[PDB]
Amino acid sequence: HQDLPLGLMDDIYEFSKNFSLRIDELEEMLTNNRIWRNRTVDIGIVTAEDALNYGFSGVMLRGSGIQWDLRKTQPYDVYDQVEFDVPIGSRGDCYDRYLCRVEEMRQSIRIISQCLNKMPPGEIKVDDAKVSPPKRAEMKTSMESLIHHFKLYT
Amino acid sequence: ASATRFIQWLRNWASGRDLQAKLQLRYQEISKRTQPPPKLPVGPSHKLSNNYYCTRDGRREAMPPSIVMSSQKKAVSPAPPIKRWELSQDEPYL
Amino acid sequence: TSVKPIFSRDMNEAKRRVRELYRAWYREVPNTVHLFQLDISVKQGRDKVREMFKKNAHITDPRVVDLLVIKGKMELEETIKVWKQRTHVMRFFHETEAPRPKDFLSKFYVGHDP
Amino acid sequence: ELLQVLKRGLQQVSGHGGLRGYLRVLFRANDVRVGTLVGEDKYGNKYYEDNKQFFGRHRWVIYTTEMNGKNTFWDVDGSMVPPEWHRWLHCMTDDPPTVKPPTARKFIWTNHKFNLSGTPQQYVPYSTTRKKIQEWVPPSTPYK
Amino acid sequence: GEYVVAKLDDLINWARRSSLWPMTFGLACCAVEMMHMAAPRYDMDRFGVVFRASPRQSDVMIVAGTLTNKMAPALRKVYDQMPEPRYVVSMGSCANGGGYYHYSYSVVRGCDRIVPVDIYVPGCPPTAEALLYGILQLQKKIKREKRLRIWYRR
Amino acid sequence: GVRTSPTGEKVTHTGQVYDDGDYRKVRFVGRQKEVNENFAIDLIAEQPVSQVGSRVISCDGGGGALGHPRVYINLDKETKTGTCGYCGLQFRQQH
Amino acid sequence: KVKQDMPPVGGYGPIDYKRNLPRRGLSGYSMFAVGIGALLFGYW
Amino acid sequence: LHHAVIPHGKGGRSSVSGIVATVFGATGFLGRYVVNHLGRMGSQVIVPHRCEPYDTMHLRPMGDLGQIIFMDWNGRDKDSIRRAVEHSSVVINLVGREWETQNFDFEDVFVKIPQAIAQVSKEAGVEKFIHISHLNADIKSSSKYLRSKAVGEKEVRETFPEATIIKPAEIFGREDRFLNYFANIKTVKQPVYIVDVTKGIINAIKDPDARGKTFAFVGPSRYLLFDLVQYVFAVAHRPFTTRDKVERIHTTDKILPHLPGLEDLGVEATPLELKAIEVLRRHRTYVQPAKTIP
Amino acid sequence: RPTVRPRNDVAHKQLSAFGEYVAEILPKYVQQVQVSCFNELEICIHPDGVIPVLTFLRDHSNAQFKSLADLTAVDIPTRQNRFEIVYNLLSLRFNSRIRVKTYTDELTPIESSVPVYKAANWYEREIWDMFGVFFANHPDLRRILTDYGFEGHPFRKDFPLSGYVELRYDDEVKRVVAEPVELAQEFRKFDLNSPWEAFPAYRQPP
Amino acid sequence: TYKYVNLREPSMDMKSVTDRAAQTLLWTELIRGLGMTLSYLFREPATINYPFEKGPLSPRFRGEHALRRYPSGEERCIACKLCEAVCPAQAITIEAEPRADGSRRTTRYDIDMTKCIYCGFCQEACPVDAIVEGPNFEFSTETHEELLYNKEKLLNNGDKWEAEIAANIQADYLYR
Ligand SMILES: CCCCCCCCCCCCCCCCCC(=O)OC[C@H](COP(=O)(O)OCCN)OC(=O)CCCCCCCCCCCCCCCCC
Ligand SMILES: NC(=O)C1=CN([C@@H]2O[C@H](COP(=O)(O)OP(=O)(O)OC[C@H]3O[C@@H](n4cnc5c(N)ncnc54)[C@H](OP(=O)(O)O)[C@@H]3O)[C@@H](O)[C@H]2O)C=CC1
Ligand code: SF4
Ligand code: SF4
Ligand code: SF4
Ligand SMILES: [Zn+2]
Fold this sequence. Notes:
part of a larger assembly, 10 chains, A: 154 residues, mainly alpha, 54% helix, 2% strand, elongated, D: 144 residues, alpha+beta, 5 strands, 22% helix, 12% strand, binds 1,2-Distearoyl-sn-glycerophosphoethanolamine, binds NADPH dihydro-nicotinamide-adenine-dinucleotide phosphate, NADH dehydrogenase [ubiquinone] iron-sulfur protein 2, mitochondrial (chain A), NAD(P)-bd_dom_sf (chain H), electron transport (chain H), mitochondrion (chain H)
């Protein structure tokens, strides 16, 4: 809808710089806690073949060893231009899916770091006013723009 | 950021981390809440000539489906078989 | 005019499923009244069951009859397993609706609808 | 350092004008921090800042004790902040209305009102359109 | 005597508004903003509003989200189980009047068709702060009560 | 231009007011009828007519992109002013 | 001149993401030794 | 008809019934049923209340947005009564108390207050007035509650001659003090169901022939008090107050054939046998009907 | 061209070849095969072929569509068979998607596909609930999304948006009751279609 | 590219087995978790002192609606009904007619704030900046009826909040 306000990426960088430490603290509370493991390890085991036939997707597949992530196999937008790893489970239980989700949080930071560095210039919506409304300054001076703004919003 | 040296040492030791370098509370490093005005760029269609809509009209290039068989040789798969994923070299194991 | 059936090939077999459904509903009413602590009688509940069955007495299509029995069996499963609550069972009786006028004159006085 | 910590705690008692002023803010606002006075609005609300606090606690307001004839010593409301200070207090801007005043318009309210729900000043909705169909008025004279 | 009754009314009003234990009906997205009100930045517990309470120990019900037809009897059952005095806070457009789903076949057009409502919090969702404003508005409403004064003029 | 009816109720800028026998004014008992006192019709009538030296003048409402769509107003008729259809400001040709 | 939100020239500094759970403490041998030493001192 | 009170819709919650009703004493037993039936059909209900707003909350869901309006009033302040009724087409008086208090005796609640509402309503041009009295109201009763009812019934009739006066027998229902009264423990009783009384009041508002009439609302059957109380214990599975309240319970329900009843208003009286369980189920600790006098 | 979506002829050709492949192998059931301009392959089948066609796509070594992404229905009242049943399948082995469509009416049952994909169990329950299409041999067919005792199938085009009944709490009966729907503000129908044709490429013969 | 989150073999030397026995019997990893909550006890909390302190917001924030004016005091709204048309919730109701001076103005402008989803589409669609979502978010009410805004309420919101609304628009209009 709009471009990023000036100064936002600086604050996203500042947030991202410290976030992996927050993930580490979460891991200190759960990852090796025997109570957490007793609650999660070997709970809800799903086999690879059951997962596919029941229609599972996402971590419900990767927890069971299936190597599938649509951002890699059927990429959209600019996901083919970023580098990241897909976490894969080995036991297909609640504990491995917990680990997958924690590791996916780390890989999201890795991607966010690349988006911040590679953000290009230019417009932020398709320059086709039969689809995307024109800028407000254009809508208030140019006749074609006003018509297209009127019709897009009615 | 106002914690005493002893309290900073105590919580660093208990956590096993240099907490003071990555405080979860923001101070002056954030960007100012008043910013200079932007001047945003325009798109590729902002031209005064050589810019007829019929040459850049995506919606009018859409076509009805191609009918390959209607009720009125080597075997093939829908696409080539997917390629094996490579183990990460950044960090293959946790 | 040749069609794939649901459960019944003709009205004769459809009517057999209808009667079995009615027997199940008839025998279930006493449990429903007690389980849901309803404030109606068993006679009132069984009268409603007859009323619901009778309103479809005019169907001559075994496929429509089959779907009516399927839906009636679904409605019974919800009641027997207590998936319904008191509010769901009691909705059959419309005890907060004022009786709408029936004759021409009464309808003429209140508004424009037929 | 524990002596410096205790000295600073004592400096808050004097920073608030003595024990009474320290206790008043402690009980009105549950906060005894001393900031820099940024300004005061016509209703008596006072605005403070301390940029050494973390983002979010670096600006605050001590509400007036009376606003539009309502005793607000204990009953403070977030809607008592007038619009010109509202922008500063929520960090939508960096500059307070004492530095960058709002543009004056004749029609802008001279007196801010807080939330009036539950009182005799509450808004009551109603249709703003006039009657649509005019009925025939029979003659006042008799003639059947 | 009127001075004693006025003070007794003030005492019980102060205790009841200083100790509001909510039962949250987290039905949809508005529940997330309720979570952010319990989170560290706003810390509802610092006002004496405990994070979570069982229905039999709760003083205020917060309807945080869309109330469908299927759900309505369950919500009314929980309201009838709350010990008195009990208050209801309707949070967000869905609970206030149906919101985005006002015209759906499966949605109650406002929870106030099912339970009496004390405070309406607008927004889709209301911000965590806006909900906190509503809770503090409920407290001021309780501060206005004159139960003992009205009792002794009976 | 808030005028009040014989029953004491304020008349809004849209001309609305409950009449004498209308039960609906019970909603205001113990409360108030919210009325905006700044009648835009009376406020625009205060602005002066702008004297210009052209047959055609444009109005964007002021403030550039913060105003209204820019329109051009003909000032050929000398028996009336040119009024902006968006903001109501008036113009007249000099001499 | 166009002005929109952009990264600084040269990009941002490195951001950490890999798990960092450091190793701490003594070996199992030393921990049992301190425990058993404490028991023997207490018994004595 | 003023254009705003012409009925519209199908008689549901969002419809316009055309009734603008002020209901005094709406926060008690009978009040909640009357307000519910008015709001069911889209009537504008004005609720003057003496109690805390907290005690009026159960009435809010009973009407579409805007249709239930609440006002403060005082029984001894005629200015507050005038504020409540001056916009209404009908005034309903349900004020009463089963016991006397230091501030309000039976003369205040059954004579002075009803007279004040009737007079102020008359002055304000209200066209319909419904006043609830009592079947056993009697100037020479041994119960001061029933003596005051008879005096007030007379004062209302002269002050508002077109008033509809309704005289119900003891009313039973979930929130009654009749069946519940026995459950918490010579004379014949004819108790009437709460919903029948409400339907009668609503029909009286809509019936033009009801103006100026006095009605007696009684149940279909008469019972011996002993047999009735026995029946209540059996239904509750229970093994078988003030002095004034005992007097009323021991007053035989009068037979008044010269007054119209529920039948004249289109209401079919509901037997006590169909509704006792609904009221008395909460008294069970987890049935042969009573003998009826013919 | 910056604003136009680029075509992909390689994928279009591959999907066209596989579409013929399927039509040759299951001529008993396949009625139509088409590939859209954005490269999605659709196999239209006779409803008798649901189980055979799905089993072949799941199990054939040159197909291996092991994942049922979604199963839904579309109501088109102008058709004699108003309900279009759509299966969207995913093949991880070949990184491809395919769509299988069939049809039924209000009274003709469709064979349940739970034997092929266990995912179908809840999807078919939702279709029955929302469109009233009956699935034969379903392990447990019953409503899933609507309230208990709800009458009608809301997602049919002729079912009104706000339905026929609405709920409220009634104090007299001390429970939630259902009543005919009345709306304080009626939903305002908008006539938005431009009377001028937008897409000549899709013009129908007059 | 992928990695394994849990594919490891514990060492079975005596030193490793004795390490794990000590962890089992001395609760070492549980004691480690205690250390982390202890470190938080001595950290400064994140809580702000509401309502004396407020959470930060931006000029784009979508709050309570208001109807705006031109500097002359004339209403900006010219009853075009684009806002009504675009509203995803059908929360806007508009009637209009020629004003006594011939101006194209509304006679009704209602927003049901309990239908509204606070999406901001109305202020995007408005060609004259007449309808905006303001910065106010503290307007909860005690009754449902108080949230059915008519034109008088919305004009009063515009006059009440214009000082802040205009400044916020000044900060963000070059992004629109
Ligand atoms: C010279 C000869 C002398 C002879 C004597 C020598 C004896 C010394 C050697 C033996 C020492 C034994 C220590 C006894 C402590 C209990 C040991 C124990 O049972 O821990 C194991 C227990 C279960 O282990 P688990 O991993 O869950 O499963 C194993 C089964 N397959 O796991 C647990 O119980 C974990 C506890 C769960 C609760 C966690 C909450 C507590 C964490 C904080 C603890 C703080 C320390 C307590 C201090 C108390 C101070 C009063
Ligand atoms: N229920 C019965 O068995 C029968 C009842 N009636 C009559 O029906 C009417 C209502 O019956 P019921 O509803 O059972 O009575 P309730 O006591 O249940 O309700 C009494 C109503 O009167 C109001 N009220 C009482 N005293 C005052 C007062 N001093 N000033 C203002 N309001 C007051 C109460 O308001 P608050 O809640 O504020 O106290 C309440 O709304 C009464 O007139 C009663 O005599 C007649 C025959 C039988
Ligand atoms: S009001 Fe908005 S945020 Fe809240 S539940 Fe409804 S849609 Fe979600
Ligand atoms: S914010 Fe969205 S839902 Fe609300 S009035 Fe504007 S367009 Fe409608
Ligand atoms: S507020 Fe704006 S969009 Fe809505 S009717 Fe007025 S001018 Fe048109
Ligand atoms: Zn203009």
